[PDB]
Symmetry: C3
Subunit: 411 residues, 3 copies
């Protein structure tokens, strides 16, 4: 029930700030957060079953050729929106000018960012050498790959002349479809707990980081969140309408994944809600079962935009000036970064470091590190918004593609 | 066949002691033990399939509400019996006074015990973020959690108005039930090898550690084993009868898991036998599929009792006196310890260290370490008994709960 | 299509050598190899599903007793052919005298070989303590073990008097058989990409290592490849014909796995092709589903032969002379080595080190290391041939056993 999570969101926000103000933050950490973390875990639990099972069923429902057209379409969409995101972040930064006048003292946290594996590696790894391992290690891309191959192959089998082959292929499908159906059913149950979860999650963030949102760090929050707002209005909404979708209808249907993403701060972990949203939008499983898990890992408009704003904040705080040529470099790098970290765990951190280095602000610089460490103080706050844009772009792309594919039913 | 394993148990015991006496222990290690270790592996092999599959089928057979009442009931039972166990160990220690007069020289083995993760962590981890990972990593609690959720959800699906949904849910169930049935079938085969396995296992223990059972270490063995005996007679038997179960009937049915636990020294690894025992007792799968795997990981009366006796042995050997207040502390800590190590691998070692530290005998003390190292010399001997009490308590709880739940058939 | 891969093999070979000669090797590394590596990954992807599923179906189709006779038969075959292989390598070495006159300077690469776990360990580990873990970790032997047990048990279940038990066992079988069928279907698709894959793979090897094949390293290549040829002609062919199989028919059917092994340099990774080959030979799934995965891990005639030739090359390069008694030692050790590394990852490297040490040439000797490092320069070249003999022996054994088992249909 929407009312209820919205109450949880609002109540938790304010109680978090109140308790955080009176230095009862470590109480919230101890006694409250747990109930939030549970919600997250409960959702994450569904991910690898619901992604795998849904895709096998989906991949087997529609023609390979359509799937491939779907793939081209969304990939292009994911690329363009990402590029506009990081761009919009630069604009947002140049307009609001966060991080300026800051003269931080070196010391405190240092980082040695992990290096992104080469692009070839990352592409190759889309193909699992062991699908059972990919499922157990929770690797989404390889799971996507195998699910599709298996689904396609199942369809061939069901067109066999030998009944025995047909029947055993049907059984596997039905079993896997049983699992898919089950995971959607479980989502409905989990979402009853959402109010308590949503409450506890936001409460903790507000109690911990709500307080830190002051001075220049408020400028960053503003720039970021105005940026994120603008991506939704000026990009998604406009696009949705161009392709004959009512933005309000979409929000109406999408609201559940959007709210879950915001608090959960997990694109991956919101997937089950996202995927149910698309189902309830009446989108073909042959589409969203592919696009949404893909988008969840490679399509992060929120993050892109943040990377722009963060690069400028750090540059400002060091008194660096970013030429237009450097601004170009940021966009390019941001786009490449998300491609070249596609499967990689903790890809957000790596990307940022790549983007920062592209304009000569290595995180291994003590002055850069001081600046970064400052903005990290409120990352949870930032992460909520940007995660939610991350998910919302997936549904937008999925909606748009679904819409251009017109009528589409199983074979 | 019972006769046969009892012969294996007895033959192996005596041949182990004979060979061990004549310094042919490393022969037994080399050429005999392997056949025992095989038996253990063969049983362990069934665990994660039979736990998962059985629970899905079970969770789907009975109402959630009943399952929850079942859960409350056994948890309470597991708590009370654990508390009495460790208590009975203290009593057993104060009566027999093991470890007294010992003045060990420092040196030899040292330990740095692993720390137990915080209680919140341990509770949260009951919920797997990846069930395929939990299955592959052999994590029982999270597997229990997911199995139940999946089973419940399958039942909802089978009440669907859409035939297609019903059918695919049925298929998944039947597939999983096939796997469950298969694992029970395999147990029957494995247990034919039990005589050889039981023989080799006990032979090795007697040949290695049988000899060490002398002086104060005999006092410890006595105290422990008298303790373990007393738990069965004064606790399980009495309880069984209060709840209208014949202790001899129970033993008659239970004997197989009891004997397997004793030699196998693995609660987890005995599970398949335990779970077959409960089936042959005619207990609802909706009950024992839940209670027995749970009890197997969190309900260890044998270990609790040992912890009591071990704390006193170490204290005695150092000339420490344990006030009544400290004795209280041991009980509490022992109980908490098993809760706060629920999922954790090598939880036995951690628990003991926690209990020892609770009364000011840290294992990082060279004098404590010398004392502990002494009792470790015969841990295999000790472990046999205590493992068997560990398993037996599970069946007792399961029997009692099953009995209070009265008539119970699938929906 | 055969024509096409043969064109890929030939084209790639020559273009590799041409580009390699003109110092464009790192181009081939960068822009070509990827397409080859993809082919390998695509095949590896099928391995654990197709091995597991095929064996369950197979083990359930034929009587345990037959399976056991099959097992004895192939094991014996695997042992004899291995012994002849390493022997033939010694002969090949004494005839061609590779490595003689070489006086290498110490320095460059050093190795500390991993130690093989004890034989008992390796045998025990055939039995998985967690089959889900064995599947996810891609452990073949334990997967073989469990698949067989599960398959046998399924058959018992299907002879049950209770319909419910029968039906749920059937469903599991059909589901698993669906998966098996699917993997074979996928192989057919993958093999359409083979021409491009085969091209890129060979191109890279020729561009990288083709050039290094000169002087004494040419002598080694010759000795090895003549050896490998001779194993096929004098051993497999002769054996095939003794047991009433036409060598050319066999090659005709086998060619696909042979060519895939050669380029792929992965016995494991060729399995899916190998297993399809045997199916198309009309061999019982109850046989090849067992023998081929087994042979793929423990039966490596190519490697054995190489080990012989490599031991002599190293000995020659150091000016060591190998007595007839030492030559005996090599054979024995080579045979034992493959047994005592059965499941072990990177078993090839370990085996070689064991064999080298058996005659007093430890890889930790800087002079030995220099010699070994030299031959490593062309290992890819060597590996192609020896991998292909490795696979071919599996099909030969499988064909021979299948043939001696006469008519064999499901129960
Ligand atoms: C459904 C509509 C309701 C939406 C409302 C849901 C709550 C959103 C919370 C944060 C969003 C990001 C804004 C960050 C807020 C920071 C709090 C703050 O400014 O506190 C500073 C401190 O009080 C001075 O020292
Ligand atoms: C940042 C997004 C800004 C605004 C989205 C808010 C849109 C609010 C959605 C309410 C629309 C609604 O409830 O009505 C639709 C339907 O006609 C009822 O029957
Ligand atoms: C079914 C009824 C048959 C039950 C019998 C099964 C065997 C039980 C073995 C050990 C249990 C614990 C007792 C430990 C025995 C230690 C042996 C011992 O005392 O030997 C000392 C040595 O001989 C002096 O130097
Ligand atoms: C420590 C446990 C102590 C004693 C349990 C031994 C109980 C022995 C069980 C034998 C009872 C029995 O075999 O008889 C039951 C039935 O009536 C036959 O038809
Ligand atoms: C189907 C029939 C066609 C079969 C053909 C497929 C290609 C086989 C390639 C290598 C095999 C092993 C031989 C190794 C060849 C080494 C190349 C070489 O000798 O080059 C040295 C260099 O040119 C001087 O500096
Ligand atoms: C090293 C192996 C050496 C030679 C194998 C080459 C054998 C070539 C196989 C060609 C035989 C063939 O194609 O003909 C069989 C059939 O009769 C057509 O209809
Ligand atoms: C900024 C707030 C804009 C809208 C918030 C309205 C309150 C939501 C409460 C909903 C309860 C039904
Ligand atoms: C006519 C036959 C076409 C078969 C297509 C089968 C499925 C196509 C999949 C879509 C391809 C588009 C690329 C999507 C891959 C994701 C990119 C990852 C970048 C890190
Ligand atoms: C018919 C047109 C095909 C639609 C493909 C989706 C691309 C959306 C455009 C993105 C602009 C940023
Ligand atoms: C603890 C929270 C429980 C999660 C509820 C999931 C069960 C819902 C089953 C589908 C109706
Ligand atoms: C138009 C939406 C923008 C939301 C603004 C977020 C709040 C900025 C920082 C407020 C702290 C003072
Ligand atoms: C009805 C569909 C209309 C499609 C129009 C395509 C315009 C795409 C705009 C992309 C902006 C970069
Ligand atoms: C079916 C009837 C539903 C009524 C309309 C509900 C619309 C709710 C609007 C939610 C849109 C965004 C949700 C995310 C909120 C993020 C937190 C706000 C702080 C920036
Ligand atoms: C202490 C021994 C108590 C009972 C042992 C009886 C011997 C068991 C042999 C059973 C063979 C049928
Ligand atoms: C009326 C709806 C109730 C739904 C209950 C669903 C299943 C209940 C499970 C039993 C709950 C009791 C607690 C058992 C958890 C194990 C404790 C672990 C401690 C480490
Ligand atoms: C009806 C009573 C409910 C039974 C619950 C089991 C608890 C057993 C009591 C344990 C005492 C140590
Ligand atoms: C080696 C020991 C073999 C284990 C036997 C299990 C097979 C039994 C199948 C069910 C009848
Ligand atoms: C009543 C059951 C108690 C069994 C006693 C175990 C043997 C104690 C140590 C014997 C070694 C001398
Ligand atoms: C028939 C059932 C009788 C139940 C009696 C309950 C007594 C529980 C004793 C617990 C001791 C702590
Ligand atoms: C159906 C007929 C069965 C006859 C009765 C069998 C009863 C056997 C008693 C076994 C009870 C405990 C088994 C574990 C033995 C532990 C080793 C003893 C040393 C302490
Ligand atoms: C050495 C070469 C021996 C046979 C090679 C023949 C060329 C193969 C081309 C086949 C195309 C149909
Ligand atoms: C009459 C009952 C026989 C049951 C046999 C069940 C299956 C037999 C399997 C074949 C046994 C031969 C040994 C093969 C094991 C592989 C050896 C690995 C060496 C590293
Ligand atoms: C009938 C004979 C049984 C066949 C067993 C296969 C062994 C093959 C002989 C190998 C010789 C190297
Ligand atoms: C990229 C290469 C695609 C691999 C093709 C496998 C799909 C074949 C399905 C069975 C016909
Ligand atoms: C009879 C098959 C033997 C193939 C010979 C392989 C080539 C040896 C090295 C050639 C390089 C000069
Ligand atoms: C028709 C089958 C004939 C079998 C002959 C057996 C000979 C095996 C030769 C082995 C050589 C070591
Ligand atoms: C069905 C018609 C097929 C025609 C006959 C095809 C026979 C091809 C012969 C291939 C045999 C070996 C294949 C591996 C080649 C290894 C590379 C050669 C260099 C040593
Ligand atoms: C406003 C909420 C989002 C709507 C997204 C529009 C995408 C339409 O979705 C499409 O609709 C077709 C017609 O029913 C179906 O046949 C297709 O399977 C489906 O993909
Ligand atoms: C003495 C061996 C242990 C017996 C345990 C008694 C628990 C009874 O078990 C119960 O029996 C009911 C009546 O048949 C069944 O309907 C229930 O499913 C079952 O849980
Ligand atoms: C030349 C290609 C290899 C041929 C291998 C010969 C092995 C024969 O294979 C056997 O044939 C029998 C008769 O059809 C079948 O009933 C058996 O299932 C099968 O194992
Ligand atoms: Na994007
Ligand atoms: Na996304
Ligand atoms: Na207990
Ligand atoms: Na237990
Ligand atoms: Na061999
Ligand atoms: Na092989």
């Amino acid at each position: 029930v929407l009312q209820k999570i919205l109450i949880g969101l609002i109540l938790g926000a304010i109680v978090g700030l109140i308790l955080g103000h009176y230095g009862y933050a470590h109480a919230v950490h101890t006694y409250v957060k747990p109930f939030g973390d549970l919600f997250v875990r409960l959702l994450k639990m569904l991910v690898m079953p619901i992604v795998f099972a849904s895709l096998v069923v989906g991949a087997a429902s529609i023609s390979p050729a359509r799937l491939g057209r779907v793939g081209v379409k969304i990939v292009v969409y994911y690329l363009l929106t990402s590029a506009f995101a990081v761009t919009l972040g630069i604009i947002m930064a140049r307009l609001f000018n966060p991080g300026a006048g800051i003269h931080l003292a070196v010391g405190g946290q240092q980082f040695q960012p992990h290096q992104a594996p080469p692009l070839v590696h990352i592409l190759l790894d889309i193909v699992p050498t062991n699908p059972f391992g990919a499922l157990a290690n929770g690797q989404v891309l390889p799971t996507i790959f195998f699910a599709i191959i298996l689904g396609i192959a199942i369809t061939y089998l069901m067109n066999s002349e030998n009944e025995k082959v047909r029947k055993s292929a049907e059984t596997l499908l039905d079993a896997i479809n049983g699992l898919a159906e089950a995971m959607y059913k479980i989502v409905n149950g989990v979402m009853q707990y959402a109010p308590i979860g949503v409450f506890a999650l936001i409460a903790y963030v507000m109690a911990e980081q709500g307080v830190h949102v002051v001075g220049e760090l408020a400028k960053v929050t503003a720039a970021v969140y105005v940026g994120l707002t603008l991506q939704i209005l000026l990009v998604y909404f406009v696009l949705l309408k161009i392709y004959g979708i009512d933005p309000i209808s979409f929000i109406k249907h999408a609201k559940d994944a959007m709210l879950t993403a915001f608090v959960t701060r997990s694109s991956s972990g919101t997937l089950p809600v996202t995927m149910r949203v698309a189902k309830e939008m009446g989108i073909s499983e042959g589409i969203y079962s592919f696009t949404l898990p893909l988008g969840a890992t490679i399509n992060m408009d929120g993050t892109a935009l943040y990377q722009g704003v963060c690069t400028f904040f750090i540059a400002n705080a060091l008194g660096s000036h970013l030429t237009v040529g450097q601004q170009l470099t940021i966009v390019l790098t941001a786009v490449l970064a998300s491609i070249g970290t596609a499967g990689v765990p903790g890809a957000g951190a790596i990307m940022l470091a790549m983007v920062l280095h592209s304009v000569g602000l290595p995180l291994t610089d003590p002055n850069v590190a001081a600046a970064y460490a400052m903005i990290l103080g409120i990352d949870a706050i930032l992460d909520m918004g940007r995660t939610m844009v991350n998910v919302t772009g997936d549904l937008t792309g999925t909606a748009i593609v679904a819409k251009t594919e017109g009528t589409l039913v199983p074979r």
